[PDB]
Each structure stands twice: as structure tokens, then as C-alpha cells.
């Protein structure tokens, strides 16, 4: 039920007086297909340890994403210190059009058609954090209705 | 700056009412009197690089005041040119 | 960059020159060789690269390159060059197409024969 997929692994290393202690980091995001998605960073001695640590880190902090029937609410734009992210809710059956790192974090979220673009650098951690940030601060019509004290009909 | 008995005489000679020390008509006259007074000292030793800043500043202020005069009310403007002999 | 700084001077567009100017916006010219010799490449490459200085029709003078194994290109043998940059040699961007009206294609080859102009074996 909780879908997950490894995005990228890096041969991180921190030197010691003897030589290079080759570690292995990993990143993985989990999601149910609805407005319940969380990510997790991993850093351990091996790929299995790294992915299981990233998983257990992602088994928590379930971010609730405001989603439409099968698409995003409205175009949003986010950035976290490394690059910007821009995405447009597209039509039905036009394909999950994303680039690299964003494809995983957008397919695990259960949305199948979003028109997205990522300006800036392509650091996977930063870009996935920016995507999650831009996905969290979205908003559904009923929420704006309650905020303004109006109805979903008055805002259409 | 200048003695009060001179500023008061200027504002009573160019003031269209009582104690209008800020009406441009008395401002320009006070500024000309001050510049004519500082000219005597400026004519000496030619080496006052610093004090020329206020000189150019008040010249520019009088210029912008006359610009406002010709931009909003030209009657008094043309009426005061011949009083002090401006435009050289 | 305010809008006034753009109205007084438009966005200065910059163009990128072509790396192979001798072709003069063409895919391949005809050239006449002047010298045939070999030079060793730079570290970390160790070989004797078969190069040659070729005189072109338009009056230029550029170095060429021959690939494969063995050749017969002596002096006064006109050739054709289509271009192509290689790093291991200093600023040469001209490869000689094997099998253009003067260059005999490499012999004893059965794979990728199109790049070296080798007829079909029977």
C-alpha cells in the first residue's frame, strides 16, 4: 500500500588518517497514492542499511498534500536554497511529465498528469525537498472558503 | 549665518504679509544677500574647496525655486526679477 | 536592469562562432595535402597519430587526420575532409573520409565498413 522507490545513491566518503572510509547515502520517498506522502534521507554503511534507514525515516512525518480528483489544485512554485520548482496541473491522460528526480516524488504521490519544470541545479535532495515544499503549501477550494468565511459555490 | 536685523529687514521688505519668512519671495532675497556676503570672503586665497559645497547648494536651491516660480505662478516671478537684477 | 536601461540599449545578444571555420559553412570541402607525417599525442596518450597538413580550395591551410590502419596518402594526393574535433591533438578539427575519389579504404575489415569505405565482401 505504501509505495516507495529509491531515487539516487551517492558514494559519500569522509577521510580518516588512514584512508577513505567509503560510505553510501540514499534517498527514498513513500506515499499511498493519495494526499499522504513522506520522504526520508539515508546514510549508512551499505545500500540496504541506507534504504531501510531512509524508509523508517519516511514511515513517519506523513505530509498531507491537498489534491484534486486526480491532479494538483493549481500551479505552484517552490524553492529550497538550491533550485526552483514549477508545476502545472495538466489534463487527463497526458502522462506524468517530469524530469529525473521529480518523476519519482510525483509518481509516488498518486498524481498521473502534472506539467512540471525545474529551473536551477539538479541536486536530488534539494529538488525533492523543494517539490515537497511546493506540494505542502497548496490549498483546496473548501479550505479557502472556510478561511474567507465563504462557500465553495461563492468562489467556484 | 546672518544677523537677525538683516533677515528681519529682508522679510519685511519682501514679505507680502507679516512674518512670512518662508515665502519664496523673501527666501530668494535672503539667499542672494548671503551669497553676495560670502562672495567677499570667497574672493580671498581661492583655496576653500570645502565651503564651495554650500555655495553650489544654495545656487541650485535658488534655481529650483525659480523653476517652481515659472512652473506654477509666473506673475510674481516676472514682478521680482527687476527688484534684485537677476538673470545677469 | 531597469526597463529604462533596456529602452536606451536593447539586450546585447551574443553569438557563438563555429569551431570549424575552414569549411566555410559546408559539410566537406576538397583539399590537397602538403606534408605527411606523424606526431605523438599528449599525456595520458601514447601513439603516433597519422596527421597531415592539407591545402584547401578557398586558400586555407589546416591539419587533417586519418583513422583506421595503414594508408597510401602521399604528397599531392587530393582528399576530402568533413571535420570533427579530437582532444588528444592540439587544435585539429578535420578528419579525412576514407574512400573519396583518391583515398583507398582500409583493408581486412568486416565491421563498420561505411565509416572507412570498405566494399561488401563475397
Amino acid at each position: 500500500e505504501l509505495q516507495e522507490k529509491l531515487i539516487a545513491v551517492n558514494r559519500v566518503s569522509k577521510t580518516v588518517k588512514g584512508g577513505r572510509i567509503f560510505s553510501f547515502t540514499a534517498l527514498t520517498v513513500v506515499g499511498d497514492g493519495n494526499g499522504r506522502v513522506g520522504f526520508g534521507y539515508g546514510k549508512a554503511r551499505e545500500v540496504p542499511a541506507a534504504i531501510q534507514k531512509a524508509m523508517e525515516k519516511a514511515r513517519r512525518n506523513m505530509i498531507n498534500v491537498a489534491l484534486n480528483n486526480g491532479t494538483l489544485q493549481h500551479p505552484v512554485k517552490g524553492v529550497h536554497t538550491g533550485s526552483r520548482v514549477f508545476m502545472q496541473p495538466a489534463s487527463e491522460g497526458t502522462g506524468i511529465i517530469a524530469g529525473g528526480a521529480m518523476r519519482a516524488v510525483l509518481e509516488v504521490a498518486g498524481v498521473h498528469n502534472v506539467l512540471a519544470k525545474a529551473y536551477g541545479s539538479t541536486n536530488p535532495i534539494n529538488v525533492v525537498r523543494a517539490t515537497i515544499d511546493g506540494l505542502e503549501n497548496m490549498n483546496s477550494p473548501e479550505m479557502v472558503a472556510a478561511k474567507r468565511g465563504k462557500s465553495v459555490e461563492e468562489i467556484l | 549665518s546672518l544677523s537677525t536685523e538683516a533677515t528681519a529687514k529682508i522679510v519685511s521688505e519682501f514679505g507680502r504679509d507679516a512674518n512670512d519668512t518662508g515665502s519664496t519671495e523673501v527666501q530668494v532675497a535672503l539667499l542672494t544677500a548671503q551669497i553676495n556676503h560670502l562672495q567677499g570672503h570667497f574672493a580671498e586665497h581661492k583655496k576653500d574647496h570645502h565651503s564651495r559645497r554650500g555655495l553650489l547648494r544654495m545656487v541650485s536651491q535658488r534655481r529650483k525655486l525659480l523653476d517652481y516660480l515659472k512652473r506654477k505662478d509666473v506673475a510674481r516671478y516676472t514682478r521680482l526679477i527687476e527688484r534684485l537684477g537677476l538673470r545677469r | 536592469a531597469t526597463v529604462n536601461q533596456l529602452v536606451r540599449k536593447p539586450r546585447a545578444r551574443k553569438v557563438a562562432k563555429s569551431n570549424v571555420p575552414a569549411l566555410e559553412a559546408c559539410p566537406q570541402k576538397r583539399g590537397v595535402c602538403t606534408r605527411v607525417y606523424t606526431t605523438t599525442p599528449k599525456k595520458p596518450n601514447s601513439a603516433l597519430r597519422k596527421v597531415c597538413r592539407v591545402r584547401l580550395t578557398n586558400g586555407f591551410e589546416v591539419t587533417s587526420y586519418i583513422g583506421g590502419e595503414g594508408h597510401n596518402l602521399q604528397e599531392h594526393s587530393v582528399i576530402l575532409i568533413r571535420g570533427g574535433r579530437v582532444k588528444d591533438l592540439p587544435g585539429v578539427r578535420y578528419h579525412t573520409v576514407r574512400g573519396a575519389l583518391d583515398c583507398s579504404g582500409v583493408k581486412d575489415r568486416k565491421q563498420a565498413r561505411s565509416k572507412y569505405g570498405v566494399k561488401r565482401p563475397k
Partner: protein, 80 residues
């Protein structure tokens, strides 16, 4: 009904002819900014009716010289 123009006056040195100026307000195409462009026109004049700094309403007619085909029909804001 007759299409006319309206602008300022630059000079009247030559007799029976003045060089009026018109400032159109055009939106810049590429940068969307609104900038004022000033054009000049040689207008055939009579009796040297106007001077520098006046406003005049002019209309277009047949050419009367090498670089002058406009005539003036009425004056507004006759002051300097």
C-alpha cells in the same frame, strides 16, 4: 469630421512656414513600457500667425514644397 492633428510649435524662422512637433504616446512592443515619441512636421503657414511655444491644430493637404505638405487651420492656447 475632418481628421486633424494637434501639437506644439518649435520654430518659425522661415516665413510662411513653421516646424510643428507632435508627441505620440506609444507602448513599447518588446518591453511593454509606455514611452513618448516626438515627431516633427513642416507646416505651410500664412502671415506668420504663430510663434514659438504655441499649440496649433493642423490638417494634411497636397504637397506645397520639397518637405512640406501640411497646413494649419486653427490655433489653441495662443499664449506663449
Amino acid at each position: 469630421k475632418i481628421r486633424t492633428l494637434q501639437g506644439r510649435v518649435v520654430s518659425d524662422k522661415m516665413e510662411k512656414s513653421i516646424v510643428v512637433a507632435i508627441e505620440r504616446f506609444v507602448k513599447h512592443p518588446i518591453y511593454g513600457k509606455f514611452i513618448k515619441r516626438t515627431t516633427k512636421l513642416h507646416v505651410h503657414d500664412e502671415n506668420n500667425e504663430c510663434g514659438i511655444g504655441d499649440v496649433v491644430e493642423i490638417r494634411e493637404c497636397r504637397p506645397l514644397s520639397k518637405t512640406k505638405s501640411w497646413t494649419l487651420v486653427r490655433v489653441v492656447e495662443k499664449a506663449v
